[PDB]
Design a protein around this nucleic acid. Structure first.
Length: 137
DNA sequence: AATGTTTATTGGAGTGTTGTACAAAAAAGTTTCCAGTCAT
């Protein structure tokens, strides 16, 4: 909407709005990044966020973006990992044959680099950690 | 228009889990002060 309050005046209106009986909503999407910064001592930030789309008239699609996969079983405790699910599909880094193809798409009509230098740069980054940002730099 | 709430804010105001000694009661080790012998 457009109303701005605070962490308590607003946090109380969002709790009573998701449980409103007799009001249609839309299939929204929630995209959050870096979950370790939202961790508090009472664990009342990640636990209540996952219980919102588990209601009747709730169309929230949470896209929890983080780093490693063992976070729910390390930093977060039992209540956060319970009401979540085991639907954690990790993404593996690019292979050696994939780094030479992504760089080829960017240089489709750029006649300025030999074929012996393209595979050499994509070889050192593939052995370090396979980061997609450490190859084009 | 003449007030008075909010609105974070903030430096206190404690807070509890830390870590580095701490002071023994033992653990060692350290020869021990005669013992034996032997003679005369």
């Amino acid at each position: 909407t457009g109303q701005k309050a605070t962490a308590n005046h607003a946090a109380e209106l969002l709790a009573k709005q998701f449980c409103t009986r007799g009001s249609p909503q839309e299939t929204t999407v929630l995209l959050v990044d870096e979950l370790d910064l939202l961790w508090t001592h009472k664990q009342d930030i990640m636990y209540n966020l996952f219980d919102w789309p588990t209601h009747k008239e709730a169309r929230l699609v949470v896209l929890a973006i983080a780093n490693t996969m063992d976070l729910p079983e390390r930093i977060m405790m039992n209540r956060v990992s319970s009401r979540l699910g085991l639907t954690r599909m990790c993404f593996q880094p690019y292979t050696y044959s994939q780094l030479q193809q992504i760089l080829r798409s960017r240089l489709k009509h750029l006649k300025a680099f030999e074929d012996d230098a393209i595979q050499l740069v994509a070889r050192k980054v593939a052995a370090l950690s396979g980061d997609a940002r450490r190859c084009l730099d």
